[PDB]
Amino acid sequence: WTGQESLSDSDPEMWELLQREKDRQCRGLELIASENFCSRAALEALGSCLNNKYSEGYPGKRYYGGAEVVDEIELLCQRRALEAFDLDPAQWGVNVQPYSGSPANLAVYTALLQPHDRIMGLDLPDGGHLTHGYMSDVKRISATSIFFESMPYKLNPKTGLIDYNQLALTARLFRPRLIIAGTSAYARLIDYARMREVCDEVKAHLLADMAHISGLVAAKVIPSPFKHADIVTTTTHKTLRGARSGLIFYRKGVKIPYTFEDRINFAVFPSLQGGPHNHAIAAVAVALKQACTPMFREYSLQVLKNARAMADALLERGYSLVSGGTDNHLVLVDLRPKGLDGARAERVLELVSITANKNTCPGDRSAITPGGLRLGAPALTSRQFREDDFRRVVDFIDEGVNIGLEVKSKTAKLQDFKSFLLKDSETSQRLANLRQRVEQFARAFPMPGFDEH
Amino acid sequence: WTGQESLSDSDPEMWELLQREKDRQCRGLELIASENFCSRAALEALGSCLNNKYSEGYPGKRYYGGAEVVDEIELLCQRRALEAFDLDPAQWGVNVQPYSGSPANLAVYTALLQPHDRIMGLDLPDGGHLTHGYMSDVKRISATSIFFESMPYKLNPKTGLIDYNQLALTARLFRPRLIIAGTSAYARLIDYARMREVCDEVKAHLLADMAHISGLVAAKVIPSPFKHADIVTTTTHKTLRGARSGLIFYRKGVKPYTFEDRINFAVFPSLQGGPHNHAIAAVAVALKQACTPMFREYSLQVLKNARAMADALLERGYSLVSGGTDNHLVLVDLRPKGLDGARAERVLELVSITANKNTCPGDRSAITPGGLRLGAPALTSRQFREDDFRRVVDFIDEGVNIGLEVKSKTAKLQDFKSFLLKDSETSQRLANLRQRVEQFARAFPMPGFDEH
Amino acid sequence: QTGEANRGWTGQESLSDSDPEMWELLQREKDRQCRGLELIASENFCSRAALEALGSCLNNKYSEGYPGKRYYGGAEVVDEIELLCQRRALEAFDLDPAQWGVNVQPYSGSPANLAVYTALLQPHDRIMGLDLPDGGHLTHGYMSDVKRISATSIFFESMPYKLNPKTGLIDYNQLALTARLFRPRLIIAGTSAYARLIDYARMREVCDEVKAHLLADMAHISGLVAAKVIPSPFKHADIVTTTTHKTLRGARSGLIFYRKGVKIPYTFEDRINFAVFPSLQGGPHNHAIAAVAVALKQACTPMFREYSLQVLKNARAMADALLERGYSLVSGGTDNHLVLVDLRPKGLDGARAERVLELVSITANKNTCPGDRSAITPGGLRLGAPALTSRQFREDDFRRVVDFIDEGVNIGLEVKSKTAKLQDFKSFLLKDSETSQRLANLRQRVEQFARAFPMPGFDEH
Amino acid sequence: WTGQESLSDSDPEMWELLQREKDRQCRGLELIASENFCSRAALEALGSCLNNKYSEGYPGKRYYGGAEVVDEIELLCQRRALEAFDLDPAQWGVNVQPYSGSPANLAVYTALLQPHDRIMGLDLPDGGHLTHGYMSDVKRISATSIFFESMPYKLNPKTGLIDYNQLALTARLFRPRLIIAGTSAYARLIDYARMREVCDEVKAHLLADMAHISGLVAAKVIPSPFKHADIVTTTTHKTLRGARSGLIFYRKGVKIPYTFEDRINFAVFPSLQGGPHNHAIAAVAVALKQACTPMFREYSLQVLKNARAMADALLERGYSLVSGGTDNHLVLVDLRPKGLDGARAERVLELVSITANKNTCPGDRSAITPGGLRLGAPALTSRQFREDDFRRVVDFIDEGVNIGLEVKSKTAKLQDFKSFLLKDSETSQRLANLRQRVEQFARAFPMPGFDEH
Ligand SMILES: Cc1ncc(COP(=O)(O)O)c(CNCC(=O)O)c1O
Ligand SMILES: Cc1ncc(COP(=O)(O)O)c(CNCC(=O)O)c1O
Ligand SMILES: Cc1ncc(COP(=O)(O)O)c(CNCC(=O)O)c1O
Ligand SMILES: Cc1ncc(COP(=O)(O)O)c(CNCC(=O)O)c1O
């Protein structure tokens, strides 16, 4: 046994699964707003001998020897991270070790807050992330609501925008130590200057969690949270089009000096994590280099143009959009006007190889049947889709909604609806014909990555 | 731009860095007990399109659609993890999503304990891990000592073994809700039956963190913690020779056990986000390798190589903490030899021999460890046999003797280290030994890709 | 060797002979009480009968535990006393013992509240109370922008609710809105400085919506509730705390009332009793329990209802006389035993005013008013009727009190015109002879008026 | 109604209860070690107009005016507290507001410790107090085990003394922030120097809770904890013979200053308490002045002699004593070498007007039938009992034990034993005969306080 054999020869069962997943990615219209297609070059680094190295600590201050090269790699990743976001190294630093977005946010809280200290984030149903402190009326869900004390802030339900007035009012009462400015499902730009004004008033730290918009910020196609935030976290796998990982950026130097750097780094290691994933660090450095180029600015501009074109095509077809439209990479569709909920539409669309996700809308009454869908442009933009192609995407979505509207007319419950899509041969024929046309269209576009896996 | 360009063309700077790390691995005697050389096959899965897929939730109970294939992959990984450890699904389940070892242990605590509930693990200086609740006299270090309340248990310093008697005595006073049985630096087998007795007496959960020994357990060359533990965590990148990831195994069925829902909920949605499906797949590749006769022979050889290295050090007048080994590693006490582990680790590093300093019970300076931790898994993966490990020990001894000369000529640690670099006479002797070490090491096979 | 050198200690000596220094101090405090216009809204004058029980051999008895469930024997009499106090507590508030129980051991009001929190909540569970500047109490969860002040904000997680600044009333609408976001496990309805009746029905609505416990802390109003002169919180709360020394006119102590029996049963009783003992307290203060029982029996009488109705009438007379002299009142009036004066329009703050009044033997306390721009210089005064009502003051007597207050306010306005900082104002009251003589004349007139009225308790101590 | 009517005229029911309790105190042999008989002078202050004054805050730093006289009283009480313990006011301060012992200890923890910080105290079954952190295997019992994290230390079961070696060992592992040296049932002197050594080694605060022994310390008849602890709590109603209350003493001044004073005072008010009980403060001040006198040193010497006389008489009658003897005001009798448990014995004695309490002994296996009794000398010594009188006390105890043995031989369960004492005519006649002799003896001795209440 050498350990130099190929995957296709040594584990045919797993090789076939990898090929099947690649085929799914190539034949579908992937609209999940948080997905993208990582470059072959980044994946070549991800799947490398860097996986083998234990390097707990930080460059020059490791616990083990043999770190000469991973030191150089980690420091290069830091430099490319600051370069990608146009940050002066004397005013900003970055921790490139977080294993994903959720680890990054937990490390920030652990660095800057004591257990049971208070945080405020946008409520999950209103478009925030689990790690912004989510708990429900009946139990504590995110660990960020167990180890810390959270209170959400909300959209203004009439407008679909973050209610900055109510946030200010309730932060004066709750006295958060940290407020999170960032979203998983919000189509508008965040008023970071106002967020900072609230935080300065109540003496809270401002954390911007820019995971969804990070590449747009790097490409300078939307305003940067770094102009107003103390700390900025992100993932590397969304609009940044990298391998799955996290980053934490923090201010350093003169404010009296800043005191984030030592606390942030200590929280990541030794408090929370173990050995870094040097293969992920390397892949991230590759993608960060890509994000610095003119190619990536043009990609990011096309992401916005494509999201806008998707929004307009939906409005032209009588759909409604939460907040009335978009200013970023995604659109929040409200389907209740058309008479079909997001759980139903999501399933019909899945069966024709269009992947989206059901999304709660302002005013929704039940979670099992949310009113909306979240649709994103980053992934398909990476396949060189343009505006006209996203109009075809909406054409196909509308066909699927129409199919769903007929099945809803012949079915009672969410489970009846779902089996009907499989049982009724007349329904599964229309699904099959739509799926074939969907896959013919999607299969025709290029795809980043390896050829077959 | 296609995103299909090769790394070698599109990012030369990073490509030469990857090649440099591969060269470093190939030319070294890599004795870090937690390291291994992952197979090309697993690395091919690790760097795949599985990176692209968001799949929050669990097979058949995802937040989103499109998960047909990742569902099959995640379920296959679970099946292969149970098979590698000879586990019946009716008695055991597994969570294959933890991003690493430390995430795995934190998920167990979050799942079973309230904030500030009490845990006991082996103290870090005595061989336990950070995530077993480590804090120092000076401040709280691991988050496992911040969100939970930890009190360590200790070695008997006269034997080098876990002091099960004192663990029993202190557990009755401290009342832990969970006790961790598992080590980062311990060369003997843990008495899991005794740990079970203590846990039963004080009504604590028994967690076995088998990260270091996981490959040996799968290979059935040492006894298994699954006979006595409620929960077992592990990494997949040490003796299991996989990609970097974690696993949480838990009892289920009649005892009914109530671990499964809590464990799975803690990993997601409580602690983690989207799974790293490329990592899950790579782990599944390694787990299948771990079920083969090849891997049992590998693991038997790891044991024999550790024993051979131990016996050679004893022959050269080294002392061993607990007097020997029954697993993949050796704990060397350099104190009698007159050199500490901080000094020895650095001299060895400069001759391409990678180990790490290790505290010894006989230590008089809590700041400067008196020992080294040496492991056989990595070099065994390159087909080293017992005689090769004897030659490793002769190279170590050459380096230790250099260290002793430099100690006689320098005062503080920093002085020692700088002298190794800049004293021309010393650097020449180090260069000679380094060349012999490297040319020896380069001649062995190496798992993975050819050049990266 | 003769006299006191030839006499052994008995522990039966009178205080006046055995400790002349302390005896002189007690008499001086009695004199201070008799010669002052005592307007602190939380104060009262305890009866001789209750004080005689407070200073009794019941001090000597350790009785950890509860009646019939004690750690030590010899408890037959203290058991009867504690049970009597419980029965008299329930009688005073018209409570069926099949539906309500009472714990009579809390050492004071703050211990009573902490015991409820410890009984029903886990550490760091959430509570909501009226903010301290807005009229709430420390133990309702107070912390400031700069640090945690009450232990109820240390061991538990509090967020305040607020007055509507424009009406001076509790903003029930905002409480409902914020409770939904904060998800409290317990909400406190009760105040230290609030002149209006609390809408306990609305508070129960909010608590029912968000699945919180409703605690009514009726300390200030307890005697008014007992006398049935204002609505009872027991109609809507299932837990009620109080002190025994404010409007109930007893010895310093606390009480915790709780629902019991069929709600499927209530499960307050065992937890609240356990929190008080063994969790928080040690041996009860049986002398205090007995004194409280004496005052509770008094509170059941027609005499006490007539007292409580007079407290309301006197507070209203004080309010009306203030309004006639151009004073502003927070919420525009009073429905209870106290008045909240807003001095800002008159041009004088509550810190300045309380000090002038103090120097003429009128004891009130400065009080934050809605819109105050600075707490060193709060805008108002809190003025209470219970203590002077116990001395048989009637409405015209409270009109005379206001005349004296207004004279003091006028002296303060004159001193403010002559000084800059609060520290200079205060020194001027003492060092300027013109001012000092004006204060002495007003003090003489205040004291001669007050001394003529009867006083509960012993004659001289 | 004037509020000037006497208790006897206005509430005859309560008046009769007070007289019944007074009669019970006069006719019994009160051996509860934490009890005493407070002076009339102290009681006159306790039942005074001082009840009426709200005085939140501290002297010269109050919330409300009118505090001129209560300021003088509180400061006088502080000076008298320092004087009774021979403390230099430039090196020690004292807080006289705690409402009882348990409030005093909770205030110390709240002042010096964060929530969930670690405390160690002597385990309750081994002689410690609830407020030293007690929890059982099954439930958190004391609030000091809920808001803080406690671990007990133990007696050496062979010797009956605190095991200082094991305390040192376990404190190194548990890392307490505070260790309590003080007991509710311990007959020996505590090695405060050794406790301090341990605290200095692990960097814990040493709190001496001297409640039981405070009068013996003030009289200088046993060594003072103030030589080795820098924080000391106590009650005022045990051997100090005052009204029920608490005190917290702390070092102040140059240690770089001590920082106890401001934290302790703030913990008491505003954190934990509300208005002080000025009547109690005054009564405490009266008792403290008494404690400064030669009379009180003679009383305390006699307490020691009487406890030793009682111990000696029990040994001569074949009883065993936990730890082998006594050095203080109490004796821990082990009844197992007589064959009668403490639950049975306590009840027998109660029915013959001798009040003691059952006490767990080393080796006991059931808390429901512990092996012993705790007996104290302070209360009866305050009635002018001398050594021969305590020998008579032991004679009566032994008769009671013998009755208990006879009933034990005729009954099964604890419940049957207890009902036999009341319902067996022969046993009831024997108890009545013993009770009359006990009461005839006890009534002949004087009693501090009022004549009839
Ligand atoms: C027993 C044990 N448990 C958990 C971990 C954590 O694994 P991660 O580094 O992936 O978080 C380690 C790592 N120990 C590394 C070493 O011994 O060198 C470990 O030794
Ligand atoms: C704002 C935000 N923050 C953090 C995360 C967490 O990243 P990980 O999944 O790597 O833990 C997400 C993921 N959001 C996924 C989605 O919106 O579909 C996110 O949207
Ligand atoms: C509503 C309320 N609750 C509890 C207390 C506390 O009682 P103790 O001081 O006995 O702890 C007060 C005292 N407040 C005093 C005042 O308003 O002036 C109070 O007003
Ligand atoms: C050492 C010690 N500390 C504090 C207390 C508490 O005092 P309070 O009961 O006033 O809260 C006691 C009471 N112990 C009483 C006994 O031993 O019988 C005590 O023994």
- The CATH code of the domain at B39-291 is 3.40.640.10
CA B234 – CA B98 distance, rounded (Å): 10
Contact B171, B120 (CB under 8 A): yes
| Burial degree of C96 (CB within 10 A; 0-12, 13-18, 19+) | exposed
* First vs last C-alpha separation in chain B: 24
C-alpha torsion sign, points B344, B346, B347, B349: positive
Could you give the count of Cα atoms lying within 13 Å of A1 in the half-sphere of its Cβ?
A: 19
Asked if the C301-461 domain carries CATH number 3.40.50.300, the reply is: no
Q: Which residues contact B213 (CB under 8 A, 6 or more apart)?
A: B182, B222, B239, B327, B328
**Catalytic one among B118, B177, B238, B407?**
B238
| Residue located nearest, by CA, to atom 18 of ligand 1 | B34
Residue C243 DSSP class: E
Within 10 angstroms of residue C122's Cβ, the number of other Cβ atoms is 12
CA D46 – CA D242 distance, rounded (Å): 10
Contact B14, A43 (CB under 8 A): no
**Catalytic one among C30, C31, C62, C171?**
C62
Q: Which residues contact A319 (CB under 8 A, 6 or more apart)?
A: A333, A334, A335, A337, A338
Residue D93 DSSP class: E
Equal CATH topology for C47-300 and C301-461: no
Of C221, C163, C172, C166, nearest in space to C332 by CA? C166
Q: Which residue of B has its CA nearest to D139?
A: B175
β-bridge mates for residue D250, sequence order: D93, D231
Contact B134, B150 (CB under 8 A): yes
Which backbone phi and psi does A217 adopt, to 5 degrees? -65, -50
Nearest atom of ligand 4 to the alpha carbon of D184: 20
Active site residue C64: yes
Strands A320-321 and A330-334: antiparallel
The residue whose two tokens read 């019909």 is A348
Helix ranges (H only) for A117-211 are 164-174, 192-202
Chain pair A-C, CB pairs under 8 angstroms: 28
D299-336: burial string, b at 16+ Cβ within 10 Å, e else = bbebbbbbbbbbbbbbbeeebbbbbebbbbbbbbbbbb
Ligand 4 center from residue D55 Cα (angstroms)? 26
Query: Which of C34, C56, C287 to mutate: most D Cβ within 10 Å?
Result: C56
* First vs last C-alpha separation in chain D: 24
Of C182, C193, C181, nearest in space to C219 by CA? C193
Contact B222, B327 (CB under 8 A): yes
Strands A372-376 and A357-359: antiparallel
Pick from A4, A45, A146: which is nearest to B115 by CB? A146
Q: Is the CB of A182 under 6 A from ligand 2?
A: yes
Contact A36, A382 (CB under 8 A): yes
CA D133 – CA D203 distance, rounded (Å): 19
CA A128 – CA B80 distance, rounded (Å): 36
Contacting residues of B for A295, CB less than 8 Å apart: 1
Active site residue C139: no
CA D286 – CA D39 distance, rounded (Å): 9
Contact C33, C388 (CB under 8 A): no
Q: Is the CB of C129 under 6 A from ligand 3?
A: no
| B34 touches A: beta carbon within 8 Å | yes
* Resolution of the entry in angstroms: 1.2
The rounded radius of gyration (Å) of the Cα atoms in chain A is 23
| Distance (Å) from the alpha carbon of B387 to chain A's nearest alpha carbon | 20
Within 10 angstroms of residue B384's Cβ, the number of other Cβ atoms is 22
Active site residue B21: no
| Residue located nearest, by CA, to atom 7 of ligand 2 | A101
Contact C1, D437 (CB under 8 A): no
Residues 128-157 of D with CB under 8 A from B: 135, 137, 149, 151-152, 154
The residue whose two tokens read 């505006």 is A387
Active site residue A238: yes
| A88 touches B: beta carbon within 8 Å | no
The CATH class of the B292-452 domain is alpha beta
Residues 377-396 of B with CB under 8 A from A: 381
| Distance (Å) from the alpha carbon of C182 to chain A's nearest alpha carbon | 6
Of C159, C140, C160, nearest in space to C150 by CA? C140
Residues 332-371 of D with CB under 8 A from C: 346-347, 349-350, 355, 357
CA A47 – CA B244 distance, rounded (Å): 11
Nearest atom of ligand 1 to the alpha carbon of A54: 18
- The CATH code of the domain at C47-300 is 3.40.640.10
Give CB contacts under 8 A, 24+ apart, made by B143-147: B143/A110, B143/A267, B143/A271, B143/A272, B143/B106, B144/B105, B144/B106, B144/B109, B144/B119, B146/A110, B146/A115, B146/A271, B147/A115, B147/A147, B147/B109, B147/B110, B147/B115, B147/B116
Contacting residues of D for C22, CB less than 8 Å apart: 45, 73, 76, 282, 285-286, 289
Strands D330-334 and D372-376: antiparallel
Amino acid identity of residue D327, one-letter, is: D
CA D106 – CA D98 distance, rounded (Å): 10
Nearest atom of ligand 3 to the alpha carbon of C40: 18
Question: Which residues line ligand 1 at a C-beta cut-off of 6 Å?
Answer: A 54, 274-275; B 34, 100-102, 129, 131, 182, 184, 209, 211-212, 235
Q: Which residues contact A98 (CB under 8 A, 6 or more apart)?
A: A104, A107, A233, A245, A246, A247, A248, A268, A273
Could you give the count of Cα atoms lying within 13 Å of B387 in the half-sphere of its Cβ?
A: 1
Looking at domain D293-453, which of 3.90.1150.10, 3.40.50.2300, 3.40.50.300, 3.30.420.590 is its CATH number? 3.90.1150.10
Q: For residue A12, is the peptide bond before it cis, meaning its omega torsion is within 30 degrees of 0?
A: no
Contact A278, B38 (CB under 8 A): no
Q: Beginning with the edge strand found earlier in the chain, give each strand of the sheet holding D118-122 in spatial order.
A: D92-95, D246-251, D231-235, D205-209, D178-181, D118-122, D149-153
E strands in D305-371: 320-321, 330-334, 354-355, 357-359
A227-240: burial string, b at 16+ Cβ within 10 Å, e else = ebbbbbbbbbbbbb
CB–CB contact B72 A17 (8 Å): yes
Within 10 angstroms of residue C437's Cβ, the number of other Cβ atoms is 10
Alpha-carbon separation of residue C345 from B333, C327, C329, C331, C374 (angstroms): 83, 8, 10, 15, 15
Amino acid identity of residue B147, one-letter, is: F
Asked if the D39-292 domain carries CATH number 3.40.640.10, the reply is: yes
Contact D446, C10 (CB under 8 A): yes
Element (H, E) at C41: none
**Ligand 4 site-directed mutation target among D132, D207, D212, most atoms within 8 Å of CB:** D212
Strands B57-58 and A92-95: unpaired
Contact D73, C46 (CB under 8 A): no
Which backbone phi and psi does D375 adopt, to 5 degrees? -125, 135
Contact C273, C103 (CB under 8 A): yes
CA B301 – CA A8 distance, rounded (Å): 28
Active site residue B194: no
CB–CB contact A32 B66 (8 Å): yes
Contact D40, C11 (CB under 8 A): yes
CA D75 – CA D79 distance, rounded (Å): 6
Whose atoms come closest to the Cα of C216: which ligand? 3
Whose atoms come closest to the Cα of C244: which ligand? 3
Within 10 angstroms of residue D201's Cβ, the number of other Cβ atoms is 11
| B180 touches D: beta carbon within 8 Å | no
Active site residue A297: no
Q: Which residues contact C386 (CB under 8 A, 6 or more apart)?
A: C41, C43, C44, C223, C246, C247, C249, C311, C337
- DSSP-assigned states of every residue in D161-180: SB-HHHHHHHHHHH--SEEE
Within 10 angstroms of residue D181's Cβ, the number of other Cβ atoms is 28
Q: Is the CB of A100 under 6 A from ligand 2?
A: yes
Please state how this structure was obtained: X-ray
The residue extents of the domains of chain B are 39-291, 292-452
The residue whose two tokens read 């075809």 is A392
| B38 touches A: beta carbon within 8 Å | yes
Helix ranges (H only) for C9-122 are 15-18, 20-35, 48-54, 76-92, 109-120
Strands B161-162 and B178-181: unpaired
Q: Which residues contact B109 (CB under 8 A, 6 or more apart)?
A: B119, B144, B147, B148, B178
Q: Beginning with the edge strand found earlier in the chain, give each strand of the sheet holding D357-359 in spatial order.
A: D320-321, D330-334, D372-376, D357-359
Contact B267, A298 (CB under 8 A): no
